[PDB]
Amino acid sequence: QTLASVSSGPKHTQSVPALTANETGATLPTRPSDNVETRTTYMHFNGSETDVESFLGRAACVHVTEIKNKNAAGLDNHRKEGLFNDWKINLSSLVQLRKKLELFTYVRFDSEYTILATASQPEASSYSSNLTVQAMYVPPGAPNPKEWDDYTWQSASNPSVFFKVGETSRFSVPFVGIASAYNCFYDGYSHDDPDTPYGITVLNHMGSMAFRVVNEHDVHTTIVKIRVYHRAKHVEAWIPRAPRALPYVSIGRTNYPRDSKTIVKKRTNIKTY
Amino acid sequence: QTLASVSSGPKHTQSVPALTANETGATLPTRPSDNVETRTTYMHFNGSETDVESFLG
Amino acid sequence: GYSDRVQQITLGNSTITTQEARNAIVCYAEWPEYLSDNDASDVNKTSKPDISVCRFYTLDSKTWKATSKGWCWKLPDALKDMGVFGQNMFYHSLGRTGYTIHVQCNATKFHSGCLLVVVIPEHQLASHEGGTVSVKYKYTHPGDRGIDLDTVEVAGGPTSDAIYNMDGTLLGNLLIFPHQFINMRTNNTATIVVPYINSVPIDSMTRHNNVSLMVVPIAPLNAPTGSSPTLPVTVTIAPMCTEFTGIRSRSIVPQ
Amino acid sequence: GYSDRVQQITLGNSTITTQEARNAIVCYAEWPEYLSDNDASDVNKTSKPDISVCRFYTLDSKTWKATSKGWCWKLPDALKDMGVFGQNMFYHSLGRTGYTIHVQCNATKFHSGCLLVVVIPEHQLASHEGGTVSVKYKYTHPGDRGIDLDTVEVAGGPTSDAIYNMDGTLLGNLLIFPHQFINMRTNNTATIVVPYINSVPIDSMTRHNNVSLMVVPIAPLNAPTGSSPTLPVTVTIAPMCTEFTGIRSRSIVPQ
Amino acid sequence: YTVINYYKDAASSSSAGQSFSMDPSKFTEPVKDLMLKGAPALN
Amino acid sequence: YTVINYYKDAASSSSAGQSFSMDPSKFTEPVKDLMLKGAPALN
Amino acid sequence: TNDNVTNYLIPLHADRQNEQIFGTKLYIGDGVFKTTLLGEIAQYYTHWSGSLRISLMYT
Amino acid sequence: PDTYTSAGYLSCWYLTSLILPPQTSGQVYLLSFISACPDFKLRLMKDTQTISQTDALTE
């Protein structure tokens, strides 16, 4: 038992806790017993669910993509045809999690990736194909796939997972930052150039993931949609910031819509209840 | 903690580690403190991922 | 006999005094200190010019008008032409420092107005255009002048929205960052001690600003009848525990 | 196994090497050291930039022709545009330092010639005109270029007399000053370590040169038949134990 | 309850426990001179 | 962390640990007479 | 245009003064270092850190 | 090669100049070597760009 409130009686002192000076920049821990006669009560509470481990410890969808399985004969752009796809791992494309991460400035953690692959056959097909997807972790510098069945899929040194459509794949990934933490924000540039981008840093690089169906082609086309979920484990977060108020518009940019002008709800009278 | 670099100051010696003879076929382990004033830093690293077990594992 | 209101800060060959202070904030309860061996990566020896760079430099004054929106300075950018500090800042590949920021605004027991003086680590600005457009280097590198929020916006520059903190967040929540107020009826000044905050031990002082000091009028300035409708705002800043490394030829930056 | 001939000097982020040395001279048998409290007058704190200024700076090369008379450099003048050293040299009212002077001249076992490399404390130059005419400031402040003794004399400049040491004394007696020779058949280089020598603890680095490095061909350069009739002469210099004080705005000098 | 790690890498393990070392002060009272609730904020 | 072998054959087991007995010398200084950094490579 | 033993030879000229002998960026995974043993093995990894050794042998 | 993570430049110049003896002429060459110091570290293993193929090989 920790006390939520203590028994407190009347006052008539020179010690006035009700008065302070917010000019100082401080917020003194006043308690109701500083301005009211109180009774003893117990916290009966530890605050587990608000620990940052908790707060960022659940899987959230961070990306949805699509691939296909057709007959690649005569097709000159496998990527455009949808025979394989990429994903430049980033956690700011889907907004639900992005607002959570951004509550802090620097963030360090391990990742638990769960990949779901569901299939659909939108047009006339005799049966539903049982496909196998390959997910390849392509670190910057490794050769990029160009065709759905390149030498690249050999993946001799790049980690890859093979799993069935309808199933799910799960693996953990260590904190892969080149610095001591990930930058939720970065008020800088890659080099002092007049035209180089701002904010986006390799200091947030987590990689690129490549996807494909390992099977050949049937008579029909099968559409595979991939959903990537991320869960943060072994979390560390520094420097809390102001919540995001305006809509997001772009990945890795604090840019906000210019026609968004009413985030705060309005009344008519400051006196109404 | 293993040291990545030690603190090292100015020099004026007869001991010249900057000069060698590659004709011998050897590569002597010179360190930046042989040609620059350095500060102490730690490896903070063991080299697990480069073990051949890893490399071909 | 001593007060929380009268204070003296002596740093190098400069001494500042205030008789109307409201304590002072030491960001995240941490005082500046040099880089330790445990935290160090770069094998090079760091240069510590001391008292030649760790002294108070006073920025060009601002004018608080009754319609003023606010001002923004980016560090270490704002001090890049300040004596031996600026020099060192452009001869080394890397540097590290903390500061003592002293914001000044005196008035009259007849005036009323309130300034919010805040230090924001990693203040990534939003662009005038929005979309995927970035804020051009020169716009986040104004030097001593800083960013005057009631200036007309240009293509590729930041927004001029104090209400949105120029980043898509709301003004009222700016209180989560180390801040202090300058309430004329009370205050005269605001002092904030800033330690080095970064995800890397040392960094490039030109391609990255670690913080941006923001002075924002919240309560409009209201001068007495017949008094001058404006008040100047002065910002004095002193680098503390400065270290430099990767010395070479002068860094070449855009402009 | 070690030799008096092969040597390495590491100062900051610069390392020099020689395989054909002839020991080295430590002026008046004294190694540089900082200013002590017992000797100090000025109450101010001294700035010690260390490894950022105490590193080797290489001056623009000279060309030893068979008719060459000699060259003269004045310190700290010759290093006034050298990185962070020059900067510090013009922001402080006073400074103090010692140096490591390294003069280089390699050749061929077929060449013959001899250079006298000497350091002269307080080398007060004589004027071209004589009489009561003084040598104009700009002529004793040539910077990196130094004074080339086989250049035509101008009004208000120094004499170009190597035989008279430019001061009314004879060349042969220049050996009373810390010196070293560069005898091709033997030598390759000359190294001289110079402590701070002055009648005042600290001084102004711009209105007073404490020493002047002089490189004077004594034995004419004689190259082998069919060989190039010239050889370059390079001078590398490193300030050691540098201290600065009286920091302020940038010193304003003539030109 | 019981848990034994089945994998070699530390990343593989499940969630870390509750920090129990909360301290709102770095954020709520980062003042240089200590202020005591009840005494004059400014003297 | 824990591991018990479920199979009889040694081949069945997982990866061997880190060697921790690195020695670049056999490759970097296979010289007969010892050379000391700082002393004349050839005398 | 073609690989040849002369790629390993840095030319030096007599009686040249103040001149530049060579220049290169420090991209160990690219440029001149890409084919070397260090650059060759560095390219099997994503990150690198450490000090480098450059020796110049006079012939 | 990434801009934020660049390592700087490397260059060579004559401090004096090369001097050849009588009865000697032409160019002289320098051999340069690269290796890592004990300082070195490499992480995050991946596939190289220094080898590929269009078809599987056969005997």
Ligand SMILES: [Ca+2]
């Ligand atoms: Ca069927």
